[PDB]
Write an enzyme that holds these catalytic residues in place. Structure first.
Site, PDB file in Angstrom:
ATOM      1  N   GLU A 115      -1.224   3.009  -8.540  1.00 52.37           N
ATOM      2  CA  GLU A 115      -2.258   1.995  -8.338  1.00 52.37           C
ATOM      3  C   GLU A 115      -1.949   0.846  -9.282  1.00 52.37           C
ATOM      4  OE1 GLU A 115      -3.283   5.255  -9.156  1.00 52.37           O
ATOM      5  OE2 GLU A 115      -3.362   5.821  -7.040  1.00 52.37           O
ATOM      6  N   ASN A 138      -0.923  -2.762 -10.816  1.00 55.21           N
ATOM      7  CA  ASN A 138      -1.360  -4.093 -10.404  1.00 55.21           C
ATOM      8  C   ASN A 138      -0.251  -5.119 -10.557  1.00 55.21           C
ATOM      9  OD1 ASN A 138      -2.860  -6.357  -9.706  1.00 55.21           O
ATOM     10  ND2 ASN A 138      -3.855  -6.521 -11.711  1.00 55.21           N
ATOM     11  N   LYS A 165       0.815  -1.208   0.000  1.00 53.48           N
ATOM     12  CA  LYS A 165       0.000   0.000   0.000  1.00 53.48           C
ATOM     13  C   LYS A 165       0.852   1.262   0.000  1.00 53.48           C
ATOM     14  CE  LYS A 165      -3.733  -2.343   2.467  1.00 53.48           C
ATOM     15  NZ  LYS A 165      -4.780  -2.163   1.428  1.00 53.48           N
ATOM     16  N   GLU A 222      -3.895  19.516  -5.560  1.00 49.82           N
ATOM     17  CA  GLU A 222      -3.377  18.703  -6.648  1.00 49.82           C
ATOM     18  C   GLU A 222      -4.239  18.909  -7.887  1.00 49.82           C
ATOM     19  OE1 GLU A 222      -3.325  14.766  -5.008  1.00 49.82           O
ATOM     20  OE2 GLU A 222      -1.274  14.957  -4.249  1.00 49.82           O
ATOM     21  N   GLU A 225      -2.095   1.082 -14.091  1.00 52.22           N
ATOM     22  CA  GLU A 225      -3.316   1.867 -13.979  1.00 52.22           C
ATOM     23  C   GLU A 225      -3.027   3.333 -14.273  1.00 52.22           C
ATOM     24  OE1 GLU A 225      -4.314   4.271 -11.511  1.00 52.22           O
ATOM     25  OE2 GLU A 225      -6.287   4.474 -12.443  1.00 52.22           O
TER      26      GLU A 225
END
Ligand SMILES: O=CCCCC[C@@H]1SC[C@@H]2NC(=O)N[C@@H]21
Lengths: 657, 489
Positions: A284, A286, A112, A196, A271
């Site tokens: 993110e 994978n 994470k 952002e 991603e």
């Protein structure tokens, strides 16, 4: 090799071996003794009770079981405990192949946190914004103008979407900062805000990656995962419309560059979030084997399973970025047992009364054969329907047609939602967003209706079917060939439409308005008492389904929706006006047990919500556990009958108020 | 021209002639007698003569096959019978006895006609005798569209099947006025003899329909199954369905646990042809299913237990239902197919106080007396006398089959273990019940004795049934000479 999954992917693997000439083994749980992957496999071993923990998740059983097949390698699958260290460690204890990525990359990237570190390691166009606290409104306005972004106001310590407001101008920036500080100071004890580059409207573009333990790293063409319900995607498509080589070539090159960065072996996928201004955001990422590749495989032919198992033996691939091209595009959808129209009610424990898959120039990957069931403690996915194409119109039409030929009986599904989404002109416009669903479905879900010509065609087909099934019952040549019917759907005969029929041949009629009216000579081809009904007037072609009838009302399906058309003659039409229509009892009150017994298990809680079709409790009598459920209601107010209360005798077990 | 029927339709009700028109073919009804008068000459009845005399009798034609029918008329004298009304019905039944044709009657009478005296009783007696004599010769179906009271109720009872209309029909022997007079309780007509009462409580009505239109539409479908007479063969219709259709879903229907329940329809539906089941008495004694169905285009009879309701246990009502169905099916040479799943009989004092011994013997008598081809399939279990009753191989059964996880034993494992070891050492449960169930609660012993022909995969049931039913088409069996039997009433 032995697989680790019990879904469609398992079948896929035991199918790739066909060409690869690789004997395969497939384990199973007790409930899955009749799953297809058990019979498709060459070997099968039981892994104890079917609850998730003992089933497949019982590493000890699985790793221990890996001692008899002889297979020099064992697939990790893509679900359950795939790509796991506690599992990778155990398999390297017994010194066996993992058919997957190396540990260091997996824990470095799937973790994470520190993913942002690898992201900023080379930057790779990661999330942009002022990296630090904005202590003054002047700084907030200046940094908003820096990029002129929608602000993406988000708390430093907040997560999950709390403490976020979207600012479009400087006044909005100030007001939303004023609200954000007040929210976050109370909610997360932190007033530190960050600004952002917010996205106008996201598309959630995904980029595929493949690699190898020797070299010849290749970038696969990107995909789409824009549509998403409850953070679960539905419809996918590899060559998205907003595709420019200027971006895409750099996307592939940067994906390959990131690949060697952590020395990734079995690439999962990249991603991104893309705005109409053609940006990209690598994060993110994978590390799992995504099974949406069929789409890519349809636009490439790159057999990911074969290449990854080849790389599992320390050999380079059989493909390079030079020959990878695009031959069109493909659409993929997922079929769930989730009842959408009924508040997404889950329908489980129903074996397939009878089902047949669409197989006309299309591909379908599924683990649910005829006479199969879905337990509550598993994935309710039915099938993964993917159709090849080259053009949007061509590929979509195929899906449209292929949706209607999928006969599913014995449980509900979401095919109506897929049909309505595909048929929507917004979806065929070319571009969509990630908030598309709830934007187009504000209150629950309501399927789109039928136009006049579609309803007329449904009437004509119903009349033809009625006449064809009528002629079957007559004896020898004493049979009719022409009638005049009066069709009207609804309990009040809304829109009485006179119809004729002539039956000139076995599968040809002469439908017209009435006698002495012009005739069209359509065609219907349907086997008696069967579902599929192919009808083709001129060029147009339609496929409808036949559920059942009671000889006055016909249950026919049109565009993945059930209707009840009434087919009656002159006398029946003129007489159905003079018929009582009683109203059934609408009682929301206590429910009683039909028969004596013993209550051994309860499902619902006292005084909470209840929905139709939910099991409530289970009596056991004379060696038999029944299960009375809640037919239909919203809530209850009552006192529960405790476990082991051998009283029954038509008592009030649950009271509905 | 819509004269004199506006008064009827205003009450949301149809007329006798309209019902007759709806039943038969579009233009194939030929009314037999239409100008007949009552010739009463009493109590001021010498006037108000009526041409039709309250009855409509004809011939008609359904699906190209002949029929006979009659319909009561409620407008004329309330539909009361007389010396003259019954003559037409007697003539129709006699003609339908000479020719092999069935009879269907739509009852609407309000009772007897008092102004005729005992002539109404004479007519009732003649109709009763014709029904009694011709039962088992030609099928008789009766539908009740309105009130039906008095002694006229008995003639529908003797008929093979009685159906009821939901909103506006009832039937009983004595009116609620007499009930109030003697007992003192105030009960409405619907609360006394409504369609629901006879559908669930008394078991007289074989079905219920929501409307007259649906009643006719489904009555035609029922008629499509029946044979024309006693000597005519079972009808066979063309059908595109074939015995080679794949049914592998039957391998998973039976759960692997012995205490879990399942729906027997999941076994019934695959074997028969698609959309060809006509359940009989669907709301009464739900633990047993009876009805008609087609197998390869020929009508057969279906009788199966259901573990969904009360663990599929035989009872009084189930016994009566199955006995009547078997007797009717055998009377007209219709094959019988049965599915067996029974743990025994329902235990309770009320049962013995109600005569389980008499009622349970009726099903056994019906199964043993029958001479039509029989096919039996044992899915899971069969214990005690229930195994004997449900068409066992010893009752001249043609072919019997079992599924690989079946069980055929004298009784449950617990009772056998108890009786086989009187005062054996405690804890005997664990190491004896398991062993006994393993060794003798399996079809291997029954197959060794020769009580089941073969143990088959559940996927071959359609193939086996079609093969056997095709081969058994020409069986000729006869019972010893009797004037008639003596069934336990
Ligand atoms: O073991 C005690 C009760 C077992 C009952 C088993 C079922 S209940 C009705 C039927 N009668 C029996 O003797 N056995 C079955």
């Amino acid at each position: 090799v032995l697989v680790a999954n019990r879904g469609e992917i398992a079948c896929r693997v035991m199918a790739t071996c066909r060409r690869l000439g690789i004997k395969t083994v497939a384990v199973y749980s007790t409930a899955d003794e009749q799953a297809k992957h058990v019979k498709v496999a060459d070997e099968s071993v039981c892994i104890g009770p079917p609850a998730s923990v003992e089933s497949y998740l019982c590493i000890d059983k699985i790793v221990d079981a890996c001692k008899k097949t002889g297979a020099q390698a064992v697939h990790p699958g893509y679900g359950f405990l795939s790509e796991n260290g506690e599992f990778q460690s155990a398999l390297q204890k017994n010194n066996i192949v993992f058919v997957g990525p190396d540990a260091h990359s997996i824990e470095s990237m799937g973790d994470k946190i520190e993913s942002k570190r690898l992201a900023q390691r080379a930057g790779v166009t990661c999330i942009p914004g002022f990296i630090g606290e904005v202590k003054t409104h002047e700084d907030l306005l200046r940094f908003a103008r820096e990029i002129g972004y929608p602000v993406m106001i988000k708390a430093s310590g907040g997560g999950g979407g709390k403490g976020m407001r979207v600012a479009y101008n400087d006044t909005q920036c100030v007001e939303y900062y004023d609200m954000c500080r007040e929210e976050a100071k109370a909610a997360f004890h932190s007033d530190k805000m960050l600004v952002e580059r917010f996205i106008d409207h996201p598309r959630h573009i995904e980029i595929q990656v493949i690699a190898d333990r020797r070299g010849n790293t290749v970038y696969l063409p990107e995909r789409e995962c824009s549509i998403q319900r409850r953070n679960q995607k539905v419809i996918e498509e590899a060559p998205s419309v907003l595709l420019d080589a200027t971006t895409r070539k750099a996307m592939g090159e940067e994906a390959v560059a990131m690949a060697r960065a952590v020395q990734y072996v079995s690439a999962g996928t990249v991603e991104n979030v893309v705005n109409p201004q053609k940006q990209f955001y690598f994060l993110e990422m994978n590390t799992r084997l995504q099974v949406e590749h069929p789409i890519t495989e349809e636009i490439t032919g790159v057999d990911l399973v074969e290449q990854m198992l080849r790389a599992a033996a320390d050999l380079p691939l059989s493909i390079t970025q030079d020959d990878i091209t695009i031959n069109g595009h493909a659409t993929e959808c997922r079929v769930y047992a989730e009842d959408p129209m009924k508040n997404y009610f889950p329908s489980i424990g129903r074996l397939t009364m009878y089902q047949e898959p669409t197989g006309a120039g299309v591909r379908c990957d599924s683990g649910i054969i005829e006479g199969s069931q879905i337990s509550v403690y598993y994935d309710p996915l039915i099938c993964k329907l993917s159709t090849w194409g080259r053009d949007r119109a061509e590929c979509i039409g195929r899906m449209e047609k292929a949706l209607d030929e999928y006969v599913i009986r014995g449980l509900r599904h979401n095919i109506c939602l897929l049909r309505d989404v595909v048929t929507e002109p917004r979806y065929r416009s070319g571009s969509i967003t990630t908030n598309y669903l709830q934007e187009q479905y504000p209150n629950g879900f309501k399927k789109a209706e039928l136009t006049a010509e579609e309803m007329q065609l449904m009437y004509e087909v119903a009349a033809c079917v009625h006449l064809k099934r009528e002629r079957l019952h007559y004896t020898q040549g004493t049979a009719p060939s022409e009638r005049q019917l009066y069709l009207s759907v609804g309990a009040g005969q809304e829109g009485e439409t006179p119809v004729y029929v002539r039956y000139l041949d076995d599968s040809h009629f002469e439908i017209g308005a009435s006698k002495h009216g012009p005739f069209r000579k359509m065609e219907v081809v349907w086997k008696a008492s069967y579902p599929i009904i192919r009808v083709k007037d001129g060029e147009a072609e339609t496929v409808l389904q036949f559920w059942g009838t009671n000889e006055v009302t016909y249950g026919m399906q049109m565009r993945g929706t059930t209707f009840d058309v009434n087919v009656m003659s002159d006398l029946q039409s003129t007489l159905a006006h003079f018929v009582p229509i009683t109203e059934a009892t609408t009682n929301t009150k206590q429910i009683l047990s039909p028969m004596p017994g013993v209550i051994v298990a309860i499902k619902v809680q006292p005084g909470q919500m209840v929905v139709a079709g939910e099991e409530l409790l289970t009596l056991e009598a004379m060696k038999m556990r029944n299960k009375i459920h809640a037919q239909a209601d919203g809530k209850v107010k009552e006192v529960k009958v405790k476990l082991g209360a051998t009283v029954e005798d038509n008592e009030v077990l649950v009271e509905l108020e | 021209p819509t004269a004199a029927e506006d008064l009827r339709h205003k009450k949301k009700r149809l007329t006798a002639m309209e019902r007759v028109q709806l039943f038969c073919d579009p233009g194939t009804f030929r009314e037999r007698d239409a100008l007949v008068e009552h010739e009463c000459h009493n109590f001021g009845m010498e006037k108000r003569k009526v041409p039709g005399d309250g009855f409509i009798t004809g011939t008609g034609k359904v699906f190209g096959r002949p029929v006979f029918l009659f319909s009561h008329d409620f407008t004329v004298f309330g539909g009361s019978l007389s010396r003259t009304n019954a003559a037409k019905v007697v003539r129709i039944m006699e003609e339908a006895a000479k020719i092999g044709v069935p009879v269907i009657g739509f009852n609407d009478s309000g009772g007897a006609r008092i102004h005729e005296g005992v002539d109404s009783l004479a007519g009732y007696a003649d109709i009763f005798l014709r029904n009694t004599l011709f039962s088992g010769v030609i099928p008789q179906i009766s539908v009740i569209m309105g009130p039906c009271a008095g002694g006229a109720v008995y003639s529908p009872a003797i008929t093979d099947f009685t159906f009821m209309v939901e909103t506006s029909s009832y039937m009983f022997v004595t009116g609620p006025e007499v009930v109030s007079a003697v007992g003192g309780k105030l009960v409405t007509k619907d609360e006394l003899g409504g369609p629901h009462v006879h559908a669930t409580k008394s078991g007289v009505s074989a079905g219920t329909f929501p409307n007259d239109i649906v009643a006719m539409a489904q009555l035609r479908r029922l008629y499509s199954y029946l044979p024309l007479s006693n000597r005519d063969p079972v009808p066979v219709l063309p059908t595109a369905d074939e015995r080679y259709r794949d049914v592998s879903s039957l391998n998973t229907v039976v759960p692997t646990e012995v205490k879990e329940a399942y729906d027997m329809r999941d076994v019934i539906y695959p074997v028969i042809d698609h959309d060809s089941f006509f359940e009989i008495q669907p709301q009464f004694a739900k633990n047993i299913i009876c009805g008609f169905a087609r197998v390869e285009g020929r009508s057969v009879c279906i009788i199966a237990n259901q573990p969904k309701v009360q663990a599929g246990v035989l009872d009084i009502d189930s016994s009566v239902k199955g006995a009547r169905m078997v007797r009717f099916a055998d009377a007209f040479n219709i094959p019988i197919i049965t599915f067996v799943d029974v743990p025994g009989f329902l235990p309770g004092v009320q049962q013995e106080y109600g005569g389980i011994i008499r009622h349970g013997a009726k099903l056994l008598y019906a199964y043993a007396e029958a001479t039509v081809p029989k096919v039996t399939i044992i899915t899971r279990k069969a214990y005690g006398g229930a195994y004997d009753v449900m068409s066992s191989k010893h009752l001249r059964g043609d072919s019997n089959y079992a599924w690989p996880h079946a069980e055929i034993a004298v009784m449950g494992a617990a009772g056998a273990c108890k009786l086989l070891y009187s005062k054996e050492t405690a804890e005997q449960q664990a190491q004896r019940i398991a062993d006994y169930e393993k060794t003798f609660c399996t079809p291997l012993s029954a197959a060794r004795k020769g009580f089941v022909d073969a143990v088959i995969d559940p996927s071959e049931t359609r193939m086996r049934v079609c093969e056997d039913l095709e081969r058994l088409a020409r069986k000729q069996l006869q019972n010893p000479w009797k004037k008639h039997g003596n069934i336990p009433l």
